[PDB]
Enzyme design. Sequence first.
Site, PDB file in Angstrom:
ATOM      1  N   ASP A   7       0.851  -1.180   0.000  1.00 35.13           N
ATOM      2  CA  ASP A   7       0.000   0.000   0.000  1.00 35.13           C
ATOM      3  C   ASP A   7       0.885   1.226   0.000  1.00 35.13           C
ATOM      4  OD1 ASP A   7      -1.673   2.184   0.649  1.00 35.13           O
ATOM      5  OD2 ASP A   7      -2.888   1.052   2.001  1.00 35.13           O
ATOM      6  N   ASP A 105      -2.978   2.465  -5.858  1.00 32.08           N
ATOM      7  CA  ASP A 105      -1.906   2.453  -4.841  1.00 32.08           C
ATOM      8  C   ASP A 105      -1.849   1.199  -3.956  1.00 32.08           C
ATOM      9  OD1 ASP A 105      -4.386   3.218  -3.734  1.00 32.08           O
ATOM     10  OD2 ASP A 105      -3.451   4.521  -2.228  1.00 32.08           O
ATOM     11  N   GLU A 106      -2.409   0.091  -4.446  1.00 32.74           N
ATOM     12  CA  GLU A 106      -2.523  -1.135  -3.659  1.00 32.74           C
ATOM     13  C   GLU A 106      -2.479  -2.384  -4.509  1.00 32.74           C
ATOM     14  OE1 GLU A 106      -6.149  -1.080  -1.365  1.00 32.74           O
ATOM     15  OE2 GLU A 106      -5.729   0.979  -0.686  1.00 32.74           O
TER      16      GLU A 106
END
Length: 342
Positions: A7, A105-106
Amino acid sequence: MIVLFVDFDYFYAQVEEVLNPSLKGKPVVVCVFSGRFEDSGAVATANYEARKFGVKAGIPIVEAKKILPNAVYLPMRKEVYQQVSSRIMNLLREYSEKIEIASIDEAYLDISDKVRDYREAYNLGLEIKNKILEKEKITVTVGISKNKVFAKIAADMAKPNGIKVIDDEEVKRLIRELDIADVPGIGNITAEKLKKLGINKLVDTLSIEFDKLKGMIGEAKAKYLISLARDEYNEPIRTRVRKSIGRIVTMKRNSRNLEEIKPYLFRAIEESYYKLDKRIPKAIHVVAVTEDLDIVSRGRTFPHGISKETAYSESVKLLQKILEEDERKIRRIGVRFSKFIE
DNA sequence: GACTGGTATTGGG
DNA sequence: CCCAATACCAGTC
Ligand SMILES: [Ca+2]
Ligand SMILES: [Ca+2]
Ligand code: NA
Protein backbone atom coordinates in the site's frame (compact mmCIF):
# COMPACT_ATOMS: atom_id res chain seq x y z
CA MET A 1 -1.07 -19.56 1.75
CA ILE A 2 1.14 -16.51 2.39
CA VAL A 3 -0.02 -13.13 1.12
CA LEU A 4 1.93 -9.87 0.93
CA PHE A 5 -0.01 -6.63 0.50
CA VAL A 6 1.61 -3.41 -0.60
CA ASP A 7 0.00 0.00 0.00
CA PHE A 8 1.78 3.15 -1.19
CA ASP A 9 2.04 5.83 1.53
CA TYR A 10 -0.17 8.92 1.08
CA PHE A 11 0.39 8.27 -2.60
CA TYR A 12 -0.68 11.33 -4.60
CA ALA A 13 0.88 13.88 -2.21
CA GLN A 14 4.07 11.80 -1.98
CA VAL A 15 4.43 11.67 -5.76
CA GLU A 16 4.20 15.48 -5.90
CA GLU A 17 7.10 15.64 -3.39
CA VAL A 18 9.14 13.43 -5.71
CA LEU A 19 8.36 15.62 -8.75
CA ASN A 20 9.11 18.69 -6.61
CA PRO A 21 11.77 18.20 -3.89
CA SER A 22 10.83 21.67 -2.52
CA LEU A 23 7.67 20.34 -0.86
CA LYS A 24 10.01 18.59 1.56
CA GLY A 25 8.65 19.41 5.03
CA LYS A 26 5.60 21.38 3.84
CA PRO A 27 2.08 20.09 4.52
CA VAL A 28 0.83 18.99 1.11
CA VAL A 29 -2.79 18.44 0.08
CA VAL A 30 -3.92 16.98 -3.22
CA CYS A 31 -7.50 17.83 -4.18
CA VAL A 32 -10.18 17.06 -6.75
CA PHE A 33 -11.08 20.57 -7.96
CA SER A 34 -14.61 20.08 -9.28
CA GLY A 35 -14.69 23.47 -11.06
CA ARG A 36 -18.17 24.61 -9.93
CA PHE A 37 -16.81 27.65 -8.08
CA GLU A 38 -13.51 28.73 -6.53
CA ASP A 39 -12.18 25.83 -4.35
CA SER A 40 -15.22 23.63 -5.06
CA GLY A 41 -14.29 20.02 -4.43
CA ALA A 42 -12.65 17.76 -1.86
CA VAL A 43 -9.23 16.64 -0.56
CA ALA A 44 -7.98 13.38 -2.15
CA THR A 45 -4.76 12.89 -0.11
CA ALA A 46 -3.10 14.76 2.74
CA ASN A 47 0.53 14.09 3.72
CA TYR A 48 1.57 13.41 7.31
CA GLU A 49 2.16 17.08 8.17
CA ALA A 50 -1.29 18.16 6.97
CA ARG A 51 -2.81 15.29 8.95
CA LYS A 52 -1.39 16.14 12.37
CA PHE A 53 -2.91 19.62 11.82
CA GLY A 54 -6.35 18.07 11.27
CA VAL A 55 -6.54 17.80 7.47
CA LYS A 56 -7.61 14.43 5.95
CA ALA A 57 -9.14 12.79 2.82
CA GLY A 58 -12.74 13.47 1.88
CA ILE A 59 -13.30 16.84 3.51
CA PRO A 60 -14.10 19.93 1.46
CA ILE A 61 -11.20 21.97 0.13
CA VAL A 62 -12.69 25.12 1.77
CA GLU A 63 -13.42 23.45 5.13
CA ALA A 64 -9.81 22.26 4.96
CA LYS A 65 -8.44 25.71 4.03
CA LYS A 66 -10.16 26.95 7.21
CA ILE A 67 -8.72 24.33 9.57
CA LEU A 68 -5.23 25.07 8.17
CA PRO A 69 -5.02 27.71 5.41
CA ASN A 70 -1.20 27.56 5.36
CA ALA A 71 -0.74 24.31 3.39
CA VAL A 72 0.08 23.87 -0.29
CA TYR A 73 -2.96 22.65 -2.25
CA LEU A 74 -2.48 20.89 -5.62
CA PRO A 75 -4.72 19.31 -8.30
CA MET A 76 -5.02 15.74 -9.58
CA ARG A 77 -2.61 14.41 -12.17
CA LYS A 78 -4.27 10.98 -12.31
CA GLU A 79 -2.22 10.20 -15.43
CA VAL A 80 1.12 11.04 -13.78
CA TYR A 81 0.10 9.08 -10.66
CA GLN A 82 -0.88 6.20 -13.00
CA GLN A 83 2.51 6.12 -14.70
CA VAL A 84 4.26 5.83 -11.30
CA SER A 85 1.67 3.32 -10.16
CA SER A 86 2.01 1.19 -13.28
CA ARG A 87 5.79 1.09 -13.00
CA ILE A 88 5.62 0.09 -9.33
CA MET A 89 3.20 -2.74 -10.26
CA ASN A 90 5.72 -3.99 -12.80
CA LEU A 91 8.43 -4.03 -10.10
CA LEU A 92 6.07 -6.11 -7.91
CA ARG A 93 5.58 -8.58 -10.76
CA GLU A 94 9.32 -9.34 -10.39
CA TYR A 95 8.66 -10.84 -6.96
CA SER A 96 5.54 -12.79 -7.94
CA GLU A 97 3.53 -13.55 -11.06
CA LYS A 98 0.45 -14.02 -8.84
CA ILE A 99 -0.51 -10.37 -8.39
CA GLU A 100 -3.88 -8.68 -7.78
CA ILE A 101 -3.99 -4.93 -8.31
CA ALA A 102 -6.75 -3.59 -6.03
CA SER A 103 -6.38 0.15 -6.80
CA ILE A 104 -3.91 2.73 -8.12
CA ASP A 105 -1.91 2.45 -4.84
CA GLU A 106 -2.52 -1.14 -3.66
CA ALA A 107 -1.72 -4.69 -4.67
CA TYR A 108 -1.60 -8.22 -3.28
CA LEU A 109 1.13 -10.74 -4.00
CA ASP A 110 0.62 -14.41 -3.36
CA ILE A 111 4.07 -15.52 -2.24
CA SER A 112 3.07 -18.97 -0.92
CA ASP A 113 5.51 -20.48 -3.41
CA LYS A 114 8.21 -17.77 -3.30
CA VAL A 115 9.00 -18.13 0.47
CA ARG A 116 8.64 -20.74 3.24
CA ASP A 117 7.46 -18.80 6.24
CA TYR A 118 6.85 -15.32 7.66
CA ARG A 119 10.51 -14.76 8.61
CA GLU A 120 11.33 -14.97 4.91
CA ALA A 121 8.11 -13.14 4.02
CA TYR A 122 9.25 -10.22 6.20
CA ASN A 123 12.67 -10.18 4.60
CA LEU A 124 11.18 -10.09 1.08
CA GLY A 125 8.94 -7.24 2.29
CA LEU A 126 12.04 -5.22 3.10
CA GLU A 127 13.54 -6.01 -0.33
CA ILE A 128 10.34 -4.65 -1.87
CA LYS A 129 10.44 -1.50 0.25
CA ASN A 130 14.13 -1.01 -0.68
CA LYS A 131 13.50 -1.71 -4.38
CA ILE A 132 10.52 0.72 -4.68
CA LEU A 133 12.22 3.47 -2.69
CA GLU A 134 15.30 2.99 -4.88
CA LYS A 135 13.49 3.08 -8.21
CA GLU A 136 10.74 5.61 -7.36
CA LYS A 137 11.59 7.52 -4.13
CA ILE A 138 8.20 6.39 -2.75
CA THR A 139 7.83 4.68 0.66
CA VAL A 140 5.25 1.93 1.00
CA THR A 141 3.63 -0.01 3.81
CA VAL A 142 3.69 -3.82 3.61
CA GLY A 143 1.26 -6.16 5.36
CA ILE A 144 1.82 -9.94 5.54
CA SER A 145 -0.60 -12.67 6.61
CA LYS A 146 -2.20 -16.01 5.65
CA ASN A 147 -4.85 -14.28 3.50
CA LYS A 148 -5.75 -11.08 1.64
CA VAL A 149 -7.91 -9.62 4.36
CA PHE A 150 -5.41 -9.96 7.21
CA ALA A 151 -2.59 -8.83 4.89
CA LYS A 152 -4.57 -5.60 4.28
CA ILE A 153 -5.30 -5.08 7.98
CA ALA A 154 -1.59 -5.60 8.76
CA ALA A 155 -0.72 -2.72 6.49
CA ASP A 156 -3.49 -0.54 8.01
CA MET A 157 -1.89 -1.13 11.40
CA ALA A 158 1.64 -0.36 10.20
CA LYS A 159 0.99 2.81 8.10
CA PRO A 160 2.95 4.83 7.09
CA ASN A 161 6.37 3.52 5.92
CA GLY A 162 5.85 0.23 7.76
CA ILE A 163 5.92 -3.52 7.51
CA LYS A 164 3.92 -5.97 9.61
CA VAL A 165 3.22 -9.65 9.90
CA ILE A 166 0.00 -10.88 11.41
CA ASP A 167 0.87 -14.48 12.24
CA ASP A 168 -1.53 -17.41 12.74
CA GLU A 169 -1.81 -16.64 16.46
CA GLU A 170 -2.48 -12.96 15.92
CA VAL A 171 -5.15 -13.93 13.35
CA LYS A 172 -6.94 -15.97 16.03
CA ARG A 173 -6.70 -13.09 18.49
CA LEU A 174 -7.93 -10.50 15.95
CA ILE A 175 -10.90 -12.68 15.04
CA ARG A 176 -12.03 -12.25 18.66
CA GLU A 177 -10.63 -8.77 19.34
CA LEU A 178 -10.68 -6.68 16.16
CA ASP A 179 -13.54 -4.18 15.92
CA ILE A 180 -15.50 -5.59 12.99
CA ALA A 181 -15.79 -2.07 11.55
CA ASP A 182 -12.05 -2.34 10.73
CA VAL A 183 -12.60 -5.37 8.47
CA PRO A 184 -12.29 -4.46 4.72
CA GLY A 185 -15.75 -4.36 3.08
CA ILE A 186 -17.48 -3.20 6.26
CA GLY A 187 -18.46 0.50 6.27
CA ASN A 188 -20.27 2.70 8.80
CA ILE A 189 -23.71 1.54 7.59
CA THR A 190 -22.94 -2.18 7.84
CA ALA A 191 -21.14 -1.69 11.18
CA GLU A 192 -24.27 -0.05 12.58
CA LYS A 193 -26.53 -2.87 11.34
CA LEU A 194 -24.09 -5.42 12.72
CA LYS A 195 -23.88 -3.67 16.07
CA LYS A 196 -27.68 -3.71 16.56
CA LEU A 197 -27.64 -7.49 16.02
CA GLY A 198 -24.94 -7.84 18.73
CA ILE A 199 -22.04 -8.26 16.32
CA ASN A 200 -19.03 -6.16 17.18
CA LYS A 201 -16.26 -8.61 16.39
CA LEU A 202 -15.69 -11.19 13.70
CA VAL A 203 -16.18 -14.05 16.15
CA ASP A 204 -19.73 -12.83 16.92
CA THR A 205 -20.94 -13.90 13.45
CA LEU A 206 -20.53 -17.50 14.71
CA SER A 207 -23.16 -17.05 17.47
CA ILE A 208 -26.00 -15.59 15.40
CA GLU A 209 -28.44 -17.44 13.11
CA PHE A 210 -27.12 -17.27 9.54
CA ASP A 211 -30.53 -16.24 8.11
CA LYS A 212 -30.75 -13.26 10.42
CA LEU A 213 -27.24 -12.18 9.45
CA LYS A 214 -27.89 -12.77 5.70
CA GLY A 215 -31.32 -11.10 5.97
CA MET A 216 -29.66 -8.03 7.43
CA ILE A 217 -26.43 -7.68 5.37
CA GLY A 218 -26.97 -9.93 2.35
CA GLU A 219 -25.51 -13.34 1.61
CA ALA A 220 -22.10 -12.28 0.25
CA LYS A 221 -21.14 -10.25 3.30
CA ALA A 222 -22.47 -12.79 5.77
CA LYS A 223 -20.49 -15.62 4.16
CA TYR A 224 -17.44 -13.38 3.83
CA LEU A 225 -17.48 -12.48 7.52
CA ILE A 226 -18.18 -16.05 8.65
CA SER A 227 -15.36 -17.52 6.51
CA LEU A 228 -13.00 -15.02 8.10
CA ALA A 229 -14.28 -15.84 11.57
CA ARG A 230 -13.81 -19.61 10.98
CA ASP A 231 -10.24 -18.80 9.81
CA GLU A 232 -11.16 -20.38 6.45
CA TYR A 233 -11.12 -17.36 4.13
CA ASN A 234 -8.74 -18.04 1.26
CA GLU A 235 -9.71 -16.23 -1.93
CA PRO A 236 -6.99 -16.50 -4.59
CA ILE A 237 -4.85 -13.52 -5.50
CA ARG A 238 -6.20 -12.70 -8.95
CA THR A 239 -7.01 -9.48 -10.78
CA ARG A 240 -10.82 -9.35 -10.82
CA VAL A 241 -12.89 -9.43 -14.06
CA ARG A 242 -15.08 -6.30 -14.25
CA LYS A 243 -18.84 -6.85 -14.46
CA SER A 244 -19.47 -3.17 -15.23
CA ILE A 245 -17.52 -0.29 -16.75
CA GLY A 246 -18.44 3.37 -16.75
CA ARG A 247 -17.80 6.97 -16.12
CA ILE A 248 -19.56 9.69 -14.21
CA VAL A 249 -18.71 13.39 -14.18
CA THR A 250 -19.66 16.49 -12.24
CA MET A 251 -21.14 19.29 -14.24
CA LYS A 252 -19.86 22.81 -13.74
CA ARG A 253 -23.45 23.96 -13.13
CA ASN A 254 -26.60 22.08 -12.00
CA SER A 255 -29.12 21.60 -14.83
CA ARG A 256 -32.20 20.05 -16.48
CA ASN A 257 -31.32 21.30 -19.99
CA LEU A 258 -30.45 18.38 -22.31
CA GLU A 259 -28.11 20.51 -24.33
CA GLU A 260 -26.18 21.43 -21.17
CA ILE A 261 -26.05 17.83 -19.96
CA LYS A 262 -25.36 15.96 -23.24
CA PRO A 263 -21.74 17.10 -23.62
CA TYR A 264 -20.93 15.51 -20.28
CA LEU A 265 -22.95 12.39 -20.97
CA PHE A 266 -21.36 11.90 -24.39
CA ARG A 267 -17.81 12.42 -23.10
CA ALA A 268 -18.56 9.89 -20.34
CA ILE A 269 -19.76 7.44 -22.98
CA GLU A 270 -16.75 7.95 -25.26
CA GLU A 271 -14.30 7.44 -22.38
CA SER A 272 -16.35 4.42 -21.34
CA TYR A 273 -15.89 2.88 -24.82
CA TYR A 274 -12.15 3.53 -24.62
CA LYS A 275 -12.09 1.60 -21.29
CA LEU A 276 -14.31 -1.14 -22.77
CA ASP A 277 -11.57 -1.61 -25.34
CA LYS A 278 -12.79 -4.80 -27.05
CA ARG A 279 -15.68 -5.78 -24.75
CA ILE A 280 -19.07 -5.02 -26.33
CA PRO A 281 -21.81 -4.33 -23.73
CA LYS A 282 -25.50 -5.34 -24.00
CA ALA A 283 -26.75 -3.09 -21.17
CA ILE A 284 -26.51 0.63 -20.55
CA HIS A 285 -27.56 2.67 -17.58
CA VAL A 286 -27.54 6.40 -17.34
CA VAL A 287 -26.88 7.61 -13.83
CA ALA A 288 -27.83 11.06 -12.56
CA VAL A 289 -26.70 12.48 -9.24
CA THR A 290 -29.24 15.18 -8.29
CA GLU A 291 -28.52 18.60 -6.73
CA ASP A 292 -29.10 17.17 -3.24
CA LEU A 293 -26.75 14.22 -4.06
CA ASP A 294 -29.50 11.61 -4.39
CA ILE A 295 -28.68 9.01 -7.09
CA VAL A 296 -31.25 8.26 -9.88
CA SER A 297 -30.68 5.85 -12.80
CA ARG A 298 -32.51 4.45 -15.84
CA GLY A 299 -31.36 1.63 -18.08
CA ARG A 300 -32.00 -0.87 -20.77
CA THR A 301 -30.67 -4.19 -21.86
CA PHE A 302 -30.58 -5.14 -25.53
CA PRO A 303 -30.61 -8.62 -27.07
CA HIS A 304 -27.38 -7.73 -28.92
CA GLY A 305 -24.23 -5.64 -28.65
CA ILE A 306 -24.42 -1.86 -28.22
CA SER A 307 -22.19 0.20 -30.52
CA LYS A 308 -21.07 3.64 -29.28
CA GLU A 309 -23.60 5.30 -31.66
CA THR A 310 -26.43 3.27 -30.18
CA ALA A 311 -25.12 4.25 -26.72
CA TYR A 312 -25.31 7.95 -27.59
CA SER A 313 -28.84 7.57 -28.96
CA GLU A 314 -30.08 5.37 -26.16
CA SER A 315 -28.38 7.41 -23.44
CA VAL A 316 -30.40 10.46 -24.49
CA LYS A 317 -33.71 8.62 -24.23
CA LEU A 318 -32.74 7.35 -20.79
CA LEU A 319 -31.73 10.86 -19.70
CA GLN A 320 -35.05 12.20 -21.04
CA LYS A 321 -36.83 9.51 -19.03
CA ILE A 322 -34.96 10.62 -15.86
CA LEU A 323 -35.85 14.25 -16.61
CA GLU A 324 -39.49 13.30 -17.10
CA GLU A 325 -39.69 11.39 -13.81
CA ASP A 326 -37.56 13.43 -11.36
CA GLU A 327 -37.94 17.21 -11.16
CA ARG A 328 -34.65 18.05 -9.43
CA LYS A 329 -31.68 19.66 -11.12
CA ILE A 330 -28.96 17.18 -12.10
CA ARG A 331 -25.46 17.71 -10.71
CA ARG A 332 -23.53 14.70 -12.00
CA ILE A 333 -24.23 12.64 -15.04
CA GLY A 334 -22.70 9.45 -16.36
CA VAL A 335 -23.14 5.89 -17.55
CA ARG A 336 -22.54 2.28 -16.60
CA PHE A 337 -22.20 -0.52 -19.15
CA SER A 338 -22.53 -4.24 -18.37
CA LYS A 339 -23.64 -7.67 -19.71
CA PHE A 340 -20.64 -8.05 -21.98
CA ILE A 341 -20.59 -10.38 -25.00
CA GLU A 342 -18.67 -13.62 -24.28
C1' DG B 1 -15.61 12.72 -6.34
C1' DA B 2 -15.41 8.88 -9.01
C1' DC B 3 -15.67 4.42 -9.26
C1' DT B 4 -17.67 -0.79 -9.00
C1' DG B 5 -20.17 -5.09 -6.88
C1' DG B 6 -24.23 -6.99 -4.66
C1' DT B 7 -29.18 -7.42 -4.16
C1' DA B 8 -34.34 -6.00 -3.02
C1' DT B 9 -37.66 -4.67 -5.77
C1' DT B 10 -40.38 -5.04 -10.01
C1' DG B 11 -42.81 -5.56 -14.46
C1' DG B 12 -43.64 -7.65 -19.07
C1' DG B 13 -44.22 -11.90 -22.99
C1' DC C 1 -47.67 -13.93 -13.18
C1' DC C 2 -42.13 -14.68 -11.24
C1' DC C 3 -37.33 -14.47 -12.68
C1' DA C 4 -34.24 -11.46 -15.53
C1' DA C 5 -33.87 -6.81 -15.43
C1' DT C 6 -33.86 -3.01 -12.93
C1' DA C 7 -32.44 0.84 -9.91
C1' DC C 8 -31.23 1.19 -6.09
C1' DC C 9 -27.58 0.63 -1.53
C1' DA C 10 -23.04 0.42 -0.05
C1' DG C 11 -17.71 0.66 0.44
C1' DT C 12 -13.31 2.07 -1.29
C1' DC C 13 -9.63 4.98 -2.44
CA1 LIG D 1 -4.49 2.91 0.09
CA1 LIG E 1 -2.08 4.70 0.45
NA1 NA F 1 -14.92 0.21 8.10
